């Protein structure tokens, strides 16, 4: 009955939270192994049996490591941002689609836009709390990157949204029931990888945390426990985008293991980029954001709007 409904809804949310957290913490190893073999390294195979408990080992180190809090009175404000970031990276999951009702969450695309937007405030205030020009430059560069890409991200969404005829994500499954949707929108997939990669701040768009240009960007002044939360937040983010890529382009077959095979392959693909590409410049990226992607997205918008008008004409 009714309270059966609510109890399960909370169990599912809680159950998903532990899984996504343990997955991303455990996924970190797969980055370290996989990148280890892109390079001709062997990757972690030392601790436990073949480095399986490597990420648990990492967490124990961090939580034991003290919290080298910055200048005297910043305690809270420096302690806020990691919470307010890991929260977004997790809670963004709850809109993800199921056939087995977790929610009746409509406007899921809008909610995606919103959560992906809120990352700016976390990084920016984090740098501001740190109060170190290195951290501050990182935040500004991080802010500019995310804010710029959201513009293209929105219009890109709309192409799919029109092609499915609603904002409810679930209809991606019904429209993909015959033939996958990548093979229709191939260029969008490459662009969407880049947009997703920009959001999660991975390379080639690695300006926010980065290395060798800023020490760690905003992350530079973060002690252990805060750092662990930021680091987990980023990987919860990289997984979610991998899921969103899977549900849009590659079948949305939530009740089929092949969907989870596809999750791993896409998250692998993110790493596959990590070990291959070099980094962009500031300005060249902004050209790529406004002068290249926005034009691209508008054309497809004007292309598919006509197509659906023609489609509506036919039926």
């Amino acid at each position: 009955m009714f309270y059966m409904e609510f109890i399960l809804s909370l169990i599912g949310s809680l159950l998903l939270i532990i899984c996504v957290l343990v997955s991303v913490a455990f996924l970190t190893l797969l980055e370290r192994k996989v990148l280890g073999y892109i390079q001709i390294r062997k990757g972690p195979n030392k601790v436990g049996l073949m480095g399986i408990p490597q990420p648990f080992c990492d967490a124990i180190k961090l939580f034991t490591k003290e919290q080298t809090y910055p200048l005297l009175s910043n305690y809270l404000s420096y302690y806020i941002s990691p919470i307010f970031s890991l929260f977004l990276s997790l809670f963004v999951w709850m809109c993800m689609p199921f056939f087995v009702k977790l929610y009746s969450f409509n406007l899921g695309g809008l909610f995606f836009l919103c959560c992906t937007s809120l990352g700016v405030y976390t990084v920016m205030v984090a740098g501001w709390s740190s109060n170190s020009n290195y951290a501050l430059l990182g935040g500004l560069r991080a802010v500019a990157q995310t804010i710029s890409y959201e513009v293209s991200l929105a219009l890109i969404l709309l192409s799919f949204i029109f092609l499915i005829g609603s904002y409810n994500m679930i209809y991606f499954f019904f429209y993909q029931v015959y033939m996958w949707f990548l093979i229709i929108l191939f260029p969008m997939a490459l662009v969407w990888v880049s947009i997703s990669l920009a959001e999660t701040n991975r390379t080639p768009f690695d300006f926010a945390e980065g290395e060798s240009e800023l020490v760690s960007g905003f992350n530079v002044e973060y002690s252990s426990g805060g750092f662990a939360l930021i680091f987990m937040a980023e990987y919860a983010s990289i997984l979610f985008m991998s899921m969103l890529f899977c549900v849009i382009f590659l079948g949305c077959d939530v009740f089929n293991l092949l969907f989870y095979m596809k999750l791993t392959f896409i998250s692998f693909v993110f790493i596959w980029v990590r070990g291959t590409l070099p980094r962009f410049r500031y300005d060249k990226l902004m050209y790529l954001a406004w002068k290249c992607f926005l034009s691209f997205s508008l054309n497809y918008l004007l292309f598919f709007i006509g197509f659906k008008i023609l489609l509506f004409s036919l039926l």
Binding site: N133, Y134, E211, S212, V215
Partner: protein
């Protein structure tokens, strides 16, 4: 004949034609009424890049 003389032209010409303790104090008559900006010194940001830096 009396003609408007510099005394008569000094009747006006304050920030207030009946100057008081404050208007008579400070005066700002830029005749053109178009005062050019005066450039400031925009000190830049300093970064001790390196040594601890890849």
């Amino acid at each position: 004949k009396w003609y408007p003389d510099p005394e008569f032209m000094k009747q006006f010409s304050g920030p207030v034609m009946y100057p008081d303790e404050v208007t008579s104090l400070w005066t700002v008559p830029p005749w053109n009424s178009k005062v050019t900006p005066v450039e400031k010194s925009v000190r830049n940001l300093t970064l001790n890049f390196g040594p601890q830096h890849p």
